[PDB]
Structure formats: structure tokens, C-alpha cells
Design a protein around this nucleic acid. Structure first.
Ligand code: MG
Ligand code: MG
Lengths: 407, 468, 50, 105, 97, 97, 48, 40
RNA sequence: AUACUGCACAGCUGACGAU
DNA sequence: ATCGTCAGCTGTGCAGTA
DNA sequence: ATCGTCAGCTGTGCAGTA
């Protein structure tokens, strides 16, 4: 006919969906009308001797009772509930959709608990598929849990890493210098025109990436021509003090040339976001296409009841380092907050303000912070070009898909 | 891209050859590794009359199945099975009626007038050690000792307003058969409004009444019976190896710095041995770095202590040190090694920071043991999310300890990472799973913390039972 | 003929199980040790016991 | 690992077959050579009497001399002599995990 | 040690199929099919753990320090031969080294 | 591969067992010495093997001299130390004379 | 007495001589006819 | 049948020929799981 | 002070160079 | 000789038990 | 034991895998 054949092809397709992640669905004779074959949980060539009772309904084509892409407010009967509760093995419910060939399962057991009318809220994120399979592993193991458990059920998910690769410029400039740094800061401070400070001076020579006549005058540098050296021949024999001098070069390069010029904290390290005006909000929504723009950067937190007094204002901060990991650079991030009472005067009680949200619950925004910070720095000359961190591959996943979220 | 490995959780040996990754479960399921002959443990106790009595009712009440914190997640706080007929230790523990010490309440107010605090710690600890010696003189020797301090005798000996406590009293107690065990009343009484030292707060919240009794008893069982709770298992093809670790502690005031060390290896039958060293560790310098003499001395000592027990020489030597491996002492180490004849060598350094802080996609942090090879410096996550528990024990920012092997070592960094991951929960202090810093440097810190102020006479007992 | 004797032994085991009215259903050869699943009924009482 | 890819290939090839009818039994674990017996559906009734079908499943990866238009397979003469002496036609199929390339020969 | 780990990694990688060089002259570069059911040998290779010779770095350091050309290569060859001979005499005999 | 072996006791020191016995020359009246050098493997195994040498006759006596007995023990210790990477703690010698 | 039934040529428990004596005697029996300059193997399977 | 008692497993099952029969008698048993002086 | 986790803070160390 | 750059190295207090 | 003539056969190493 129609319904019996579409039901048997549905159980064939969900047998295949069992088989696509191990999970040997061993069938049986059909002489019970309400339980299918017994599934056995398996982990990458090793059976784990864990079994789940399965049952499958016929089909679902087109719209049905409160059918939607996310809600699916469908209600089941109550006569079958006792029939689905008079059992020892955890019986799972299975349905099949021919529109996208998908498979419905969102219930296992309630231990004689009449929860409404068997709500099946499906396709909120994912159905019975490769994702969220540990919801099926933690079924025969109850909450008593003496010693028995289940390891993570294979999977394999990618993950990001928090160092941004850097592509340094091509040239570098050296010259002779017969001066002192205390004269240099004096002539930088008391000079007339605009000035930058993307240079350092060692005890013997010069160290920069600018002209013999820079935009920040030329008094500190000599009258001689600066020498043009390619950046691919730089300190590669000995003397890590030369690496330290390059570190101070890149330190002044990042300090005196950035995007939407910031202030440089000395409490945590390196830089932090400023305030645009006198105690105002600071969002700057930006994105690298996709479909979501930036959420927040700097907010203003006020007192709970004393509305006429402001509590504090927090900004975001990080600190790059210097690591020549196999002749390829990497800027390393640490997302942290920095607190003030007005945005310019530093806070005298910034110690317990870093905790709280660091104390309250799980991370839940560290991936977003990493993404927005890697997109923030990738936007006369700039003297820098940034890249994209690699995504590494893991064979294991956390079973939080099968666990319970923090309340 | 960067290469990576993952490691399954190592097991722990127990009674009846039993291997398990959960030491509470292994102890409760197969007993201790070495059972005791007699079913008696005698415990001394120092305290006022209120602490002795409710200590007795605590010992009585824990013998009936004190449950955990909650029904949810039933495996980080397991139900304690008691001390009767199903004990994890298979022995009974009691306070004998010959160790029932009390304290005089007369020498307080002039101590409270506070002319000097160093003399106060001196007279208080001299009275404590005098009582313990008088207890050990008679025919009522206990296997251990509880040194539960009076509240006023402690509050005004720690924040006495530069004092020091929890270890100086041990530093003048290497002459007693029982190794002492100071226990603050925080769980012994479990009701008092204990202060929080500097921050004037309510109290220090600890935990429920299952895990406290669990790890306290475990420490008491090791300290009393002399038997050992657990060890890691050998592998079918493993060579003979010794683990030595070195820490770099300060002075008693912190101008010169000295170096402490630890030692551990296997047994000929079914056991594990972890010792310190019964000698001084003087400076011969000021900057915190090793010397040839100290490294050669500790290498000769571990070789001698292995050959004393096994009648052979080990095929492998493992060293975990907290500073650079330079040739000023590596010549002495290597020379002592081929003077002996050991073939496989390893020299691993720790504490290089800001190297990698790998994240994941989701909400939880990384798993327990995601190791990455950063072209020579192998970083591993000794902590993290943890699947048998079902939860995430930890707050934020799990530190990925890395291994910088010296170029003299003969192994790959991934193999050494797996070996150190098998060498995290092997120390005989508490039952916690996560242990970032390994045992050879952990025990070195634990011996140096009592050696940093007294080595003048009263040579240490290297049995490690007075170090937890 | 080891497969032949294994299959006829499985079939006769299932026959002796089922002639008393006790369910037994075999599995494929992808297992290792778990040669089948048995659920019990007596006078038409098939509870989901495994 | 390769033992489960054949089972899942047979299962999804049968799901394709059962898609439009084509009644397929499969075999037991006692089989050797020829796979199970299938028929042909005719708009909801088994008008076809019987025919034989054999599964052949492989992993991800191209076949021999496969360049965007064709490929080649070789048949063992023991199997050829097995099917030549028979009383039923046989069919041969291929793998399904790159883009579900169910082919008939 | 590193040669042994890379050998195991090489076997594990090449047992799972190897892509061709390119579409230019396909018969010059046919893809390796791996040691599955499509294996062009009808057998599989495994590296048992009961016999595997790891060479210590002290002996390699001594090899790299000898100035005489002949006896250094001779002693390296002889050491390898002794390891293989003790491999053969035991109950962990391999098919090919 | 060996079918079975004796169960080692727990707590005993490492040891190697050497037999000694003698035989004739099938034409003349002389005696040789020949034996095996068995011990325990590092994993789960037993090494029972002879030596790749033939001792000389040196008279018609079923007793050796102090020039090959040292060599035999040196070969046994070298064969043990090549496999366990250390010298044993006990040597057991069985003889028919 | 523990080193008695290790001999793999037989399966009886009625063994009197220990394994090293039996192995030495069998090694000598096979070695009796080997001439000088030939190849001798350390493998035990060539002697039983 | 093999038990689930704590500790090690129970190998070397000994089977008698009186009460281990698969007849109708033993059906419900497995359904309940739910010196001397010598001279020289 | 059962421990072992992060956070925050403080002190100390060595690697280069001057009017 | 203290100031900068860079890498450690070692001590003290809170909290929450998911 | 040397030097031109012709005729051919092993070691030792570098590109390039078209
Ligand atoms: Mg024979
Ligand atoms: Mg303790």
C-alpha cells in the first residue's frame, strides 16, 4: 500500500542513519508493534556492550500539527505512554521526514512523569545526526552512577587557536648615532610639528623603518644616509639581544601606529581601548562579512540605587609577545578588562572587578572575543599586515551536547 | 597547521591487580594496593575538651555511610562507604586512651600583649613538641598525630600583629616515630565562624561531608599504616626508570636561594617508593640556578637508592627541573650517568609561558590532555573538561604546562608528554584528579617548604609520611 | 563447514528457545561475543526484559 | 572499519532499491559470492518473479583509470564461472559515499 | 626514536589511499589504493611492538665523533646487524625489516 | 612462538638460567661441552636459545677449564643486557658434572 | 622442580630431567655431526 | 550465567548434567535475573 | 591547616648598553 | 645606577564545589 | 716505465622527475 511501505523505508533510512556513526542497529522480527531492533553503541571498531531499544513510526511529508522549522509543537497520545513506560531498556522514539530525509528523536524516558502531552520540539539546532550524539550515549546509565560511564562518542570537531600570524614588511633601516636617549625624548617633546616614535636606538647604531629625514624630524638621526637591508637577513646567527632590539623596534611600531589610536596601559600590559568623549558608551559594530556584526567593546556600569553616581567603565586589553616559532611570527592574545571611574583617571579598586563575570559561569563569549579581536586589527604607511590563525583538528568532543546546561 | 595528540586517562593500580582512573572508586572497589595485617590504627590527638569528643563522634558517624553533596553528578563527591565491613582501607581507626592531650590556658594574655612573635612561635611549638615527646616516651605510642590547634593559640600565632606556621613545627619534629598531621578545626568542628585572615569575611566554605572524610582518611591511612594507597601501572615493555625533580626555594628571609629535590621509583614486588633526601642543600651561590656538585650528588644518590633495592641499575633516568639545562652541571649529570652506565636519558624543563592558549568551539574549555607539539616545545593541558564526571571542575583559564626537553634527551616529546600525563595523580596527597605540576617537582616543593628554615640538626625522615 | 555448524547451532538454540515460547533473535556477524538478544514471555506476557 | 562500510553500503543501496519498491532480501552471514535476492515492483504489486543482485561497496576514492567520464572493474573468473552456471540474472553495483553513485551493470 | 615514529606514521598514512600528482598524464601518476579490500597485494602489513629497535643518542653521538672514516661506518653497520640478529634469535621474528 | 612457560613468582629477583652438558664425537672417544642460555623476556615471553659457537675438546674429561666458562657467562650477560638494557641480579647454573 | 615440564618436545607430566639439561643434551646431539667451518644457528627449533 | 559481583570475574564455569538442562524444568532459573611413616 | 585548581597582588632573578 | 625592552622564579589570600 | 691512434666497460654525482 502506502503507509506500510513508507514506514519500512523510513526504518531502513534510520537504520542507515544509525550506521553512519557506528551504532549497529541489529533488527528483529516485527512481532511486537512498538519496538524495533536493538541498537548497540560502538566506539571506533570496539563495541561498548551498551544497548538502546528503538522504535520507529511511519513517515512525515509536508506540514503537520504546528509544524515549523524550529518550534514543531507536536503532541503525542497517552495510551502508548504507559506502553512506552512498561519497559526496562530505554525505548527511544523515531520519526522520519521525506522533505529533507531527516529523522526525529527528542525523548527517551521520564520515569512515570506525565510531562504535558509528549512534546517533540525538534530541529532547534540539529536532529538525530552526527552532531549531538552523546544525548544517546547517556541513556542506560542513570543518575545513580556508581562506577559506570561512557566515553565521548567519536565525532571529530575543529577548533580555533589564539595567535595571529604576522607578515612583516620588506626593508629595515640603520644608521650611525652619536647621541643620548634623554636628548631624544626632549627633542620629541619640545619639537614643533607632528611626530611619531616608531624607532629605537641601541648603544652603537640606529634601529628603525623610516627616512633619513623622518616625518618626526631628523635631529636624533645622523646626517649620513641610512642603509637599506631586507628583512630576511636579520640577527640569524647568535645574540638574542639583537632579537630584543627587534622586539623594541616592533614594540614602538605597534605603540605609535595602530587603528583608532589607543592608550597603552601599564597595569595589565600593552594597550587598551580609550573613551571617545566624557563617559559615553562605545560599541563600534564591525564585521568581516558573514551575518553577525560586533556586539560591544566598552560599556558603562552604574550604581544599583544611587543613580547620580557612576560605578565604573571597562575596556578590553591584550599584550603581544615575541616568538620566532620556526621562522614565522605569531602575535599572542590575552583578552582582559581594564576598569576606570571616568575613562581617563585609573581605578583604585580594579582588583575584584576583573572577577565576577570571570567567576560567574562558563566562558560563553571567549570565542566571540577572539573573533572580534582578530577582525579588529585586520582593517601614511601602516607598516604592518596581519593574517588569520590556523584551525586545528581534534578527534574528540566534549559530551555537553548530551549533558545538561548550567542554570 | 599544528600537530596534536590526545591521551586517554591513565589508570591507577590497586589491590588484586586492579587498574582504574578514579582512585576513590579503585580504593572502594578493590581495596588498597598493600593491605594491612592487623585491623587497628591508633591516632593521637591534641586539642581542647570540645574537639576530642566531637572528633570521637565524627569517627563514629563516618562509619555508617555519609553521603555526598547532592544526587546530581554522583561521581565527584561519591558516597563514603564508611569504616565498617566495606571500608576502602579495610581497617579500623580509633583514638587510644593514652593520647588525649590538652592545652593550658594560662600563657595567653601576655602573649596577647605581644612583645615579640618569634619568641611566641618558639614557646608554643616547644610546648607542642615537648608534649609529643612525652607521649612517645610512654607505652602509648600512636601511629600518627593530630595537632589540631587551639583557636586563640592559632589566630595569634599566624596573624600575630613576620611569623611562619604549618611546617616549622614539623621542622623541629624529625625525632618522633609518628609523623604529625596538623588539622585546622574547619571540618573537625565544621560549625565555627572561622575568620578569613586579611579580608574580614564570614568563613572559608570548604565542601560537603564526603570528600573531606575521603581524602583526610586516605592521607591518614598512608601516614599511619605505612602502606601505600596507589601507583601507576608498568607497561609490557617498559624499562627501569627513576624520577627526580628539583625546585628552587628561597631563604628563611629571601636573599640567598637553595634547591630542593625529590626521588621516586618502582618496587621489586607490587609497590612504589617516594623519598626526599636526608641532607642539607646549601647555596654556594645567590642566583637561582643549579651547580655541578648538587646535580652530581642527587644523581649518585638516586642511583645508589635504586641499586640498594633492586640489585640492578635502571635503564632510564628522568629529570624535571624548573630552570635552564646548561652545560655547567649537565657535564656532571652525564659524567655520573656513564660512570654508572644508564643508557636512556631524559632532561625536561618546565615554566615557559605565553606560548599557546588553545580554545575550542562551544562553551566549555578544552579536554584533559590535548597535547600540541610547537616544533619542539610540547604543550599539554593537564586540566580541562572531563567526561566521566559529566561536569567541568574548575573556574577559568586552564594552564597548558609544556615540556622543553633538553637536546641530550633520547625520546620524542609526545612520548614524554604521555609519560608525564601518566604521572599526574600518583602523589599520595588527596584524591583530586587534576594535578598540573608533576609529582617529582610537587614533592620537591613539599620538602623545600619545610627545609627553607631548619636544616640545622634533626636530619629529615625521608619516608614522605611527614610531608603531606 | 564451521559457518555451517555455527548457523545450525544458532538455529537449533533458537528453536529450543522458541518451542517453549521464549523470544530469541540473532544478530549479524559484525559483533564479537554477543550472539543474540532474548526477551521472555510466558502465556503471553512479553515484558521488555533483555 | 572496512567491515562496516560494506554493511552500510549494502543497507543504503537497499534503501535506494526499496525507494521505488524492488523487493530485496539480502543474505545471511552464510553467503559466499552472490548477495541477496531482489525483484521488481510494478506500481505496488510484485509482478516480477525473481532476479539476483550483488553488492560491491568501496570507501572514498576514485576507481581505476577514472578521469571524469568512466571507470573500469575486473571480474574474477571463479565468480564469472559461478554466475554463468546459475538459473537467474545477476546485477553489479558500486559505491555510494562520494556523491551516491549507484550504478547498474 | 623519531625515525620509528615517522615510519609508523608513514605506514598509517599510506594504508589509507594516496592521491595522484595531477590530471596531467594520468597514467604516469596513478593513485595508490591502500591496503584495504582494494589492495593490490591481497595481504596487509603490521608492525608488531614485540620487536622494534630504538637507537640511543649516546651511540649516535659516538658515531658522529669518530674521525676515522672506515671503522665508524663499520661499527654502525655491526651494531645494526647485532640488533637484527638478536631480533631473529627470539620469538619475535618479523617477515621483513 | 613458544606454547607455554613456567609462571614467575612475585618478588623474585631477575635471573638467567644456564645449563651445561657434554657429548661424544661419534667416531672417537672425546667429549665436548654444549648448553643453552635461557631467561625471561621483558614483556610476556621466554628466551630459550643456544650460543653461536662450538667449544673445543681439550681432553677426554667432562669438566671444562677457566677460559671458556668466563666467555659463556659473558655471552649470557651480553644477551641479557642487550634486551633488558641492564645487567641481571642473579645467575643460575645447572650442570651434570 | 619448577623447571621440569617446559620441554616442548613432549606433553607428559612424567618428566624427570629439567629443561636446561634436556636442551643441552639435544643441542649436543645435533651438534655432534656438524663439521668445522659450517653455519650453526642459535635457534632452538633446529635442534628439537 | 555469569554474575555481576564486585571484584574480579568468574572464569572456568563448571556445568553439571542434572540441573543445567534446557528442558521445561529449569526454565525460570535464568528468568530471575531481572601423613605416613616411610623407610629408606 | 585534605588538597588541587585559576584569579589578583607583591617581592626577587639574569641578558644586553650610556651623558 | 635606576630608569626602558625581554624571559622567569618564588610567595600569599578567595571560592566553589556541577 | 712513458707518449698520439682508435674501441669499449665500471665508479661517482647532479637535475628532474613532463
Ligand atoms: Mg623431535
Ligand atoms: Mg593533609
Amino acid at each position: 500500500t502506502a503507509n506500510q511501505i513508507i514506514g519500512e523505508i523510513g526504518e531502513n533510512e534510520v537504520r542507515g542513519r544509525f550506521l553512519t556513526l557506528g551504532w549497529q542497529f541489529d533488527g528483529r522480527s516485527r512481532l511486537e508493534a512498538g519496538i524495533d531492533g536493538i541498537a548497540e553503541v560502538m566506539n571506533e571498531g570496539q563495541p561498548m556492550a551498551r544497548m538502546i531499544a528503538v522504535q520507529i513510526k511511519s513517515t512525515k511529508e509536508g506540514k503537520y500539527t504546528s509544524e515549523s522549522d524550529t518550534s514543531f509543537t507536536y503532541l503525542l497520545r497517552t495510551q502508548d505512554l504507559a506502553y512506552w513506560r512498561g519497559s526496562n531498556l530505554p525505548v527511544i522514539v523515531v520519526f522520519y521526514r521525506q522533505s529533507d530525509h531527516s529523522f526525529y528523536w527528542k525523548e527517551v524516558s521520564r520515569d512515570a512523569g506525565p510531562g504535558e502531552r509528549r512534546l517533540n520540539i525538534d530541529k532547534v539546532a540539529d536532529l538525530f545526526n552526527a552532531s549531538t550524539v552523546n544525548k544517546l550515549a547517556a541513556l542506560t546509565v542513570p543518575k545513580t552512577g556508581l562506577g559506570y560511564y561512557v566515553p565521548p562518542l567519536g565525532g571529530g570537531e575543529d577548533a580555533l587557536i589564539n595567535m595571529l600570524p604576522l607578515t612583516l614588511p620588506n626593508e629595515m633601516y640603520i644608521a650611525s648615532t652619536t647621541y643620548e636617549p634623554r636628548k631624544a625624548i626632549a627633542v620629541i617633546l619640545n619639537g614643533d610639528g607632528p611626530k611619531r616614535f616608531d624607532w629605537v636606538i641601541n648603544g652603537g647604531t640606529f634601529w628603525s623603518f623610516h627616512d633619513p629625514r623622518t616625518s618626526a624630524c631628523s635631529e636624533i638621526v645622523d646626517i649620513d644616509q641610512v642603509e637599506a637591508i631586507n628583512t630576511k637577513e636579520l640577527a640569524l646567527h647568535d645574540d638574542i639581544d639583537e632579537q630584543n632590539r627587534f622586539s623594541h623596534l616592533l614594540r614602538q611600531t605597534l605603540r605609535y601606529q595602530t587603528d583608532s589610536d589607543l592608550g597603552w596601559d601599564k597595569d595589565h600590559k600593552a594597550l587598551y581601548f580609550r573613551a571617545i568623549e566624557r563617559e559615553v558608551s562605545r560599541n563600534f559594530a564591525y564585521t568581516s562579512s558573514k551575518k553577525k556584526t560586533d556586539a560591544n567593546v566598552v560599556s558603562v556600569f552604574k550604581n544599583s540605587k544611587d543613580e547620580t553616581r557612576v560605578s565604573f567603565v571597562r575596556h578590553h586589553a591584550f599584550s603581544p609577545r615575541f616568538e620566532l616559532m620556526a621562522d614565522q611570527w605569531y602575535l599572542i592574545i590575552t583578552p582582559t578588562y581594564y576598569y576606570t571611574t571616568n575613562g581617563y583617571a585609573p581605578h583604585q579598586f580594579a582588583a575584584p572587578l576583573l572577577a565576577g563575570k570571570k567567576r560567574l559561569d562558563k566562558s560563553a563569549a571567549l570565542r566571540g572575543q577572539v573573533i572580534m579581536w582578530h577582525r579588529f586589527l585586520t582593517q601614511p604607511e601602516a607598516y604592518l599586515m596581519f593574517g588569520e590563525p590556523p584551525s586545528i583538528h581534534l578527534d574528540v568532543r566534549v559530551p555537553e551536547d548530551g549533558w545538561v546546561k548550567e542554570k | 597547521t599544528f600537530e596534536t595528540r590526545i591521551f586517554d586517562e591513565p589508570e591507577l593500580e590497586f589491590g588484586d591487580h586492579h587498574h582504574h582512573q578514579d582512585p576513590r572508586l579503585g580504593l572502594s572497589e578493590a581495596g588498597p594496593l598493600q593491605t594491612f595485617l592487623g585491623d587497628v590504627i591508633k591516632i593521637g590527638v591534641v586539642g581542647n575538651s570540645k574537639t576530642i569528643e566531637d572528633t570521637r563522634k565524627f569517627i563514629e558517624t563516618v562509619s555508617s555511610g555519609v553521603e555526598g553533596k547532592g544526587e546530581k553528578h554522583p561521581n565527584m563527591h561519591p558516597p563514603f562507604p564508611g569504616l565498617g565491613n566495606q571500608s576502602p582501607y579495610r581497617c579500623r581507626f580509633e583514638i587510644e586512651d593514652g593520647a588525649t592531650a590538652a592545652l593550658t590556658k594560662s600563657k595567653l594574655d601576655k602573649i596577647g600583649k605581644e612583645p615579640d612573635h618569634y619568641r611566641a612561635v618558639e614557646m608554643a611549638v616547644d610546648e607542642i613538641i615537648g608534649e609529643l615527646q612525652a607521649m612517645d616516651d610512654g607505652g602509648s605510642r600512636p601511629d600518627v598525630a593530630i595537632i589540631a590547634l587551639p583557636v586563640k593559640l592559632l589566630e595569634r600565632v599566624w596573624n600575630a600583629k613576620a611569623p611562619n606556621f604549618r611546617g616549622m613545627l614539623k621542622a623541629k619534629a624529625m625525632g618522633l616515630s609518628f609523623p604529625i598531621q596538623i588539622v585546622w578545626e574547619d571540618v573537625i568542628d565544621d560549625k565555627v565562624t572561622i575568620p578569613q585572615k586579611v579580608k574580614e569575611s564570614s568563613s572559608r566554605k570548604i565542601q560537603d561531608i564526603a570528600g573531606r572524610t575521603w581524602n583526610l582518611m586516605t592521607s591518614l591511612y598512608y601516614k599511619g599504616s605505612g602502606r601505600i594507597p596507589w601507583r601507576r601501572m608498568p607497561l609490557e615493555g617498559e624499562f627501569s626508570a627513576c624520577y627526580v625533580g628539583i625546585s628552587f626555594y628561597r631563604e628563611a628571609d629571601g636573599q640567598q636561594l637553595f634547591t630542593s629535590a625529590a626521588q621516586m621509583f618502582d618496587e621489586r614486588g607490587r609497590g612504589f617508593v617516594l623519598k626526599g633526601r636526608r641532607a642539607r642543600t646549601e647555596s654556594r651561590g645567590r642566583h637561582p640556578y643549579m651547580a655541578r656538585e648538587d646535580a652530581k650528588k642527587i644523581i649518585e644518590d638516586v642511583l645508589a637508592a635504586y641499586k640498594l633495592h633492586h640489585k640492578t641499575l635502571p635503564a632510564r633516568v628522568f629529570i624535571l627541573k624548573t630552570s635552564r639545562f646548561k652545560d655547567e652541571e649537565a657535564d656532571g649529570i652525564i659524567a655520573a650517568l656513564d660512570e654508572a652506565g644508564t643508557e636512556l636519558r631524559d632532561l625536561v624543563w618546565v615554566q615557559e609561558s605565553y606560548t599557546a592558549r588553545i580554545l575550542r568551539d562551544g562553551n566549555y574549555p578544552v579536554l584533559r590532555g590535548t597535547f600540541v607539539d610547537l616544533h619542539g616545545k610540547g604543550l599539554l593541558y593537564t586540566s580541562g573538561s572531563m567526561p566521566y564526571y559529566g561536569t567541568y571542575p574548575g573556574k577559568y583559564d586552564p594552564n597548558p604546562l609544556l615540556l622543553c626537553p633538553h637536546h641530550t634527551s633520547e625520546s620524542t616529546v609526545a612520548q614524554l608528554a604521555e609519560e608525564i600525563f601518566s604521572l599526574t595523580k600518583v602523589n599520595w596527597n588527596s584524591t583530586q584528579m587534576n594535578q598540573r605540576l608533576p609529582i617529582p617537582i610537587r614533592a620537591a616543593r613539599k620538602v623545600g617548604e619545610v627545609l627553607k628554615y631548619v636544616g640545622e640538626g634533626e636530619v629529615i625522615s625521608a619516608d614522605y609520611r611527614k610531608y603531606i
